[PDB]
Amino acid sequence: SSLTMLNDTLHNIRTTNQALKKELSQKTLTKTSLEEIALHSSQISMDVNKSAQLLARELLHKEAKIANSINDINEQYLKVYEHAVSSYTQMYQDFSAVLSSLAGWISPGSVKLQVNSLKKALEELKEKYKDKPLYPANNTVSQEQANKWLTELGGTIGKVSQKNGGYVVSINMTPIDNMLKSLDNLGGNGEVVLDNAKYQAWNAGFSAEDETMKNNLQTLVQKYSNANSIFDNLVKVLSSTIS
């Protein structure tokens, strides 16, 4: 019967893959959405353990001994995309809160801008996510392992950083650095007055920053869903082989 227990766990994985796919196809990923994605991918990992624990050649005949390949796609692929999505989504959500506070930092003066309030908020964003890498979730890996995943995640959202014990793929904070440097270039005394024309380029610039970061996140979500779809197709073949 243990062969059928395997098929019941493999079928529980596809059931989770189905819910995971829907969650990732929502335009906006909320803090609630992330909590659900963590549970599903976590439930995935558990059943991938029981599968290997519990563990026609026509149907078998590329990204993927059966246990040493399913545990390979999840450990060194699905879990990586998952945590990358979590970290970047949390960063973006925290960035959106700063932009939401922007309206209350502008007033007529011709526009007066609270450059200090904006700068210090973005500084906190940078400080907060300096030790929240995309990959790995804990500890470190080899510089070569870190680079392998930078190419897979993209140099737009990630950068290999040296940390105690080895290397990680950190969040690329260049966009935040871009904003902070731009704010420094404005000068002032805590506040600054911008002619209407210059403020219009900054407001529209802030909105463009947001859309760029949103697009970065959606691209990463796309890669996680694609990997999950490759993983589901591998599970598919097994559920029909054991049957």
């Epitope: 809160a97 209350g104 500084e123 400080e127 907060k128």
Partner: nanobody, 124 residues
Framework: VQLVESGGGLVQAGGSLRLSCAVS????????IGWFRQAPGKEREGVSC????????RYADSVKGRFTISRDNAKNTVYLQMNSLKPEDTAVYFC??????????????????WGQGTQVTVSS
């Protein structure tokens, strides 16, 4: 949302006090929490703030190096260690929370919830 301060009282100039803020009614791990003070006649004044995960703390120039803010997301408590107290520090001290995760410049009108305050009196 309820914010309850304790730890105030009377103290001699040069002495110290530790304020404690009991936070009830909000996911404390998601909001910046800070301390304000208001002496009579003078305007409310930002003192310190600590963002939702504690990776940044902020202090007014008047208290930098003397005060220390800390938070315990577990115990739903925020502390303000007040050392090297001066008569200038005499005021009602308020615990306050923001709707956002970050501190930025401490500004009273950007804080969502307020405690009743507790008196700190420094006599030289």
């Amino acid at each position: 949302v309820q914010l309850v301060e304790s730890g105030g009282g009377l103290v001699q100039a040069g002495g110290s006090l530790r304020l404690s803020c009991a936070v009830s009614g909000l996911e404390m791990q998601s909001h910046a929490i800070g301390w304000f003070r208001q002496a009579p006649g003078k305007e409310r004044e930002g003192v310190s703030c600590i963002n939702d995960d504690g990776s940044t703390t902020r202090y007014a120039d008047s208290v930098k190096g003397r005060f220390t803010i800390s938070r315990d997301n577990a115990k739903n408590t925020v502390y303000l260690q007040m050392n090297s107290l001066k008569p200038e520090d005499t005021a009602v001290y308020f615990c306050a929370a923001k709707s956002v995760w970050f501190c930025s410049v401490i500004r009273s009108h950007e804080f969502n919830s307020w405690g009743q305050g507790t008196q700190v009196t420094v006599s030289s």
